[PDB]
């Protein structure tokens, strides 16, 4: 009984297939700390995964997709090395963990031809227009905030560690009031609200590179300049507000950005299409 | 009265092209609020841009290359809108700053043609064998530190505001050594040499979300996990160091990774190959 987890077009997903990876997950998850969904939905996920792998792996079988031997060969030896292992000695580590050479070899090629016909197909799907590139590049210029030295002030409206939305909405709205009346000094308003060590000192954090800022701030100061007031940004400790005080590689950064931004969209899209336009029967 | 800035294959950059682009540059620098180098090396920058612009552009013609009349106009609309103006409003800005709209429109089509050619030509060069899309994919597996929880300790080594080679070297030296002893307690080395406040509490620094950390740590953290030592990293205050304490669509990340690094790598490669395959004399 090759118990069948499900049917994808003119082929199947087994319980073997599922009950297998379904483990390698909980392993390579508790082997790197990150906890997991419900064993119920986790399955449902591993299902969706395995189904898709089929559609597109069939799509593979349909089109003339082989993967050369030298190629697969190289491919393994390079993750052998990567996780701190070796050639023949690889064999006797998963062969010593439940598997064979061919539970991996044939199993990796499946990964490889899947990667192939999945890119190869969303590749033919993306088209960047000069307009898009030009337009974007002109904007990534307005942002030109690289190692952009930057003085700024700070207002903290702090929340407790784990508040309800009743404790949050007060700070949330209270900020936007200060946000507006800041634009109509901040330094005075900082002492009158801010709850950090540099609060009574007027929110004054001082000069400092945009890099040295907490990542989440650098995401919103990127598009701003002298006088600007960004926020209110919510983090671990509550809502922050900031007042700003001072300050042919764009035709590439633009393109790399689109050629990427687009591929990520026009792949999510390409499966939405393959999934919904195929035979997906699931046997409980 | 209009000289030749430079011959560049049988065709020229003009002193006018340059002294007009130096106008387009310091026009931004005052508004963008960033200083420029010596007007002497700066001319030698713009010169070098305009030279390159040319080598490419001559390729523009060499192989026929248009720009959709509609695209050109569109980008310009899109660049107008991106700056909070209509064409009608922008028009006046072109007049007030002093440029013929059609000098400008044609000036853009210049930019657009160049891009067309650089990109079209770099994309040509990029070759991604699967043997490497796999390997890399199975390297970002044990890495995906997205909105991760993360507890750290932290040494800091002291460095004055404007440091001296000796200090800086003898500092990084001590900072390396601490790290060399760090992979052999860390908290007890806080107390030893950490310049910072937390040192007594052990550099003990608590749970941070990777994104809430300073962006100049993030770079070297996503590729590391519990029990690891990071840095020494250079910053304003000086040299940091830190312990860690707690914590397909990766073939998407994987491909994008390459599709991207390979472009950036192979543009920079082709550029230098074109300034090579080229007569070019500058006439100051």
């Amino acid at each position: 009984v090759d118990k069948v987890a499900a049917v994808v077009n003119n082929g199947v997903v087994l319980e073997s297939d599922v009950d297998g990876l379904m483990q390698s997950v909980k392993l390579n998850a508790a082997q790197a700390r990150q906890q997991l969904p419900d064993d119920a939905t986790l399955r449902h996920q591993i299902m969706e995964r395995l189904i898709m792998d089929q559609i597109i792996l069939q799509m593979g079988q349909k089109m003339g997709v082989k993967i050369s031997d030298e190629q697969l060969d190289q491919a393994i030896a390079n993750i052998a090395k990567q996780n701190n292992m070796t050639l023949d000695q690889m064999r006797s580590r998963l062969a010593y963990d439940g598997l064979n050479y061919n539970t991996y070899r044939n199993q990796i090629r499946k990964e490889m031809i899947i990667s192939e016909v999945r890119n190869n197909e969303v590749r033919r799907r993306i088209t960047i227009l000069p307009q898009e590139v030009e337009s974007l590049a002109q904007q990534v210029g307005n942002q030109n905030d690289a190692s952009t030295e930057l003085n700024l002030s700070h207002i903290l409206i702090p929340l407790p560690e784990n508040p309800t939305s009743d404790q949050v909405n007060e700070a949330e709205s209270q900020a936007r009031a200060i946000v507006d009346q800041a634009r109509n000094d901040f330094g005075k308003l900082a002492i009158a609200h801010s709850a950090d060590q540099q609060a009574l000192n007027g929110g004054q954090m001082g000069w400092g590179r945009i890099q040295e800022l907490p990542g989440i701030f650098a995401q919103a100061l990127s598009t701003a300049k002298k006088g600007d007031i960004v926020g209110p940004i919510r983090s671990g400790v509550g809502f922050h507000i900031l007042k700003v005080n001072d300050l042919a590689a764009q035709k590439d950064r633009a393109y790399r950005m689109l050629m990427n931004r687009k591929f990520s969209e026009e792949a999510a899209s390409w499966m939405q299409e393959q999934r919904a336009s195929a035979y997906v029967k699931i046997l409980s | 009265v209009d000289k030749v800035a430079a011959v560049v294959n049988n065709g020229v950059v003009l002193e006018s092209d340059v002294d007009g682009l130096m106008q387009s540059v310091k026009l931004n620098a005052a508004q963008a609020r960033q200083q420029l180098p010596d007007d002497a090396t700066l001319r030698h920058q713009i010169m070098e841009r305009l030279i390159m612009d040319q080598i490419i552009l001559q390729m523009g013609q060499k192989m026929g290359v248009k720009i959709s009349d509609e695209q050109l106009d569109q980008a310009i609309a899109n660049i107008a809108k991106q700056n909070n103006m209509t064409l009608d409003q922008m028009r006046s800005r072109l007049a007030y700053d002093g440029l013929n709209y059609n000098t400008y429109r044609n000036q853009i089509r210049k930019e657009m043609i160049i891009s067309e050619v650089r990109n079209n030509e770099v994309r040509r060069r990029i070759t991604i064998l699967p043997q490497e899309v796999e390997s890399l994919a199975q390297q970002v597996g044990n890495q995906n530190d997205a909105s991760t929880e993360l507890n750290l300790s932290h040494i800091l080594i002291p460095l004055p505001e404007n440091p001296t080679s000796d200090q800086v070297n003898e500092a990084e030296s001590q900072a390396r050594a601490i790290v060399d002893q760090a992979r052999n307690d860390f908290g007890k080395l806080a107390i030893a040499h950490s310049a910072d406040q937390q040192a007594l509490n052990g550099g003990q620094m608590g749970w941070g979300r990777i994104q809430e950390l300073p962006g100049i740590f993030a770079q070297a953290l996503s590729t590391a996990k519990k029990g690891d030592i990071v840095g020494p990293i250079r910053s304003g205050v000086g040299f940091h160091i830190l312990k860690v304490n707690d914590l397909a669509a990766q073939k998407d990340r994987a491909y994008r990774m390459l599709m991207n690094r390979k472009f950036s790598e192979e543009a920079a490669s082709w550029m230098q190959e074109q300034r090579a395959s080229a007569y070019v004399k500058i006439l100051s």
Binding site: L156, D196, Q197, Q198, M205, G206, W207, G208, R209, E212, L213, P214, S235, G236, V237, H240 | L156, D196, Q197, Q198, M205, G208, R209, E212, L213, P214, I216, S235, G236, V237
Partner: peptide, 10 residues
């Protein structure tokens, strides 16, 4: 410059 002053909020 402030890298720290600031980190010491998170």
């Amino acid at each position: 410059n402030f890298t720290l002053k600031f980190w010491d909020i998170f």
